[PDB]
Amino acid sequence: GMKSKILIFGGTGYIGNHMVKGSLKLGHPTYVFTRPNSSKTTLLDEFQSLGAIIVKGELDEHEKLVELMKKVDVVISALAFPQILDQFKILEAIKVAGNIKRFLPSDFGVEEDRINALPPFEALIERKRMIRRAIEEANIPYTYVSANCFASYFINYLLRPYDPKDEITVYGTGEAKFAMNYEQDIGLYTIKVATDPRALNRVVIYRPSTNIITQLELISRWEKKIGKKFKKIHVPEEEIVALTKELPEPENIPIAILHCLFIDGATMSYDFKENDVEASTLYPELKFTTIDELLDIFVHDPPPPASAAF
Ligand SMILES: NC(=O)C1=CN([C@@H]2O[C@H](COP(=O)(O)OP(=O)(O)OC[C@H]3O[C@@H](n4cnc5c(N)ncnc54)[C@H](OP(=O)(O)O)[C@@H]3O)[C@@H](O)[C@H]2O)C=CC1
């Protein structure tokens, strides 16, 4: 009906698939752009059975992109770090088509315009800032989503729940706060804000009050959930910093990210600005899965671990 048509790049991705599923659940005609040689064949079949329109192609196909843009209203990019500047290909098509009502670039993490990180990671988020500046320069309607930490991703990373080891690594003092959200919810809320006028040309942050915690508190709550105690092994902050200067790329990137999220506490180091929009306050019919509910999911049916591409 009146539902805006949504085009998603990287829809077969770790976070992208939750955006495709959320879009279809909400009744939006959904277009998924995917490479001709992608191995996400079974996933695409699932998307298709759910009503998605699959479009195979390369980002280098400028004409194809423009013709596709003319058929949709909203564009969401969930491309990975290695492809951040390749989003300029998407932006160029958006500009030529001229009918796009909202563009959401691939942010979905820290709020890069108000925080800084160690060189390995700083260089990467600067690429995301470059996309934002180009969007603003061209007056393209947008929504910048700071999703904070992907919960399943980092619960797996920090707790290694599938590992019967008796020790757990703690980065720094472990007292830094961070916010983490369930991937499925990040996907659903992202589709919602993409058409919500309250999110037009604004920074939307996902920071539900039930999802703020420290490494030490997460470990304590997990121990209670499974009835086991762990020996906490700390890696001093000055030690983490050294690694980012010697460990080569891409090995030093994850380390730099860990420092940003869990030592500097970048997702919780600032107060909201006048024009910021915290998403959990937007829809009374919805709510973010809480940390306790997340731990229950890991007890009953834990999702597999993942490693981002760098
Ligand atoms: N906040 C957090 O905790 C985290 C944030 N992130 C962020 O989420 C966003 C997406 O990350 P993530 O979901 O891990 O991305 P993925 O690594 O899952 O990649 C997304 C999609 O990109 C497409 N793709 C891969 N390589 C290429 C290429 N060479 N050319 C064109 N398309 C390509 C693939 O789709 P196909 O095969 O269909 O072409 C792929 O499924 C990023 O901005 C990332 O920084 C990610 C992890 C954690």
Residue numbers in the entry: 5 to 314
Question: Paper's wording?
Answer:
The basil EGS and petunia IGS are closely related to a number of other NADPH-dependent enzymes that act on phenylpropanoid-derived substrates. Structurally, the PIP-family proteins organize around an N-terminal, Rossman-fold domain, containing a core, six-stranded parallel β-sheet flanked on each face by an α-helical layer. In summary, a mechanistic scheme emerges in which binding of the coniferyl acetate substrate within the active site of EGS leads to deprotonation of the p-hydroxy group (PUSH) coupled with expulsion of acetate ion from the C1 substituent (PULL).
The structures of EGS complexed with NADP+ or NADPH provide the first structural characterization of nicotinamide-cofactor binding by the PIP family of enzymes (previous crystallographic analyses had yielded only apo-enzyme structures). Structural differences between the NADP+ and NADPH complexes of EGS are small, and center around the nicotinamide ring of the cofactor. The nicotinamide forms a planar group in the oxidized state, but is distorted slightly to a more boat-like conformation in the reduced state. The nicotinamide ring adopts the anti conformation with its B-face stacked against the side chain of Phe154 and its A-face directed towards the substrate-binding pocket. In contrast, the anti-conformer of the nicotinamide ring observed in EGS is consistent with the class-A reductase (donation of the pro-R hydride) activity of the PIP-family enzymes.
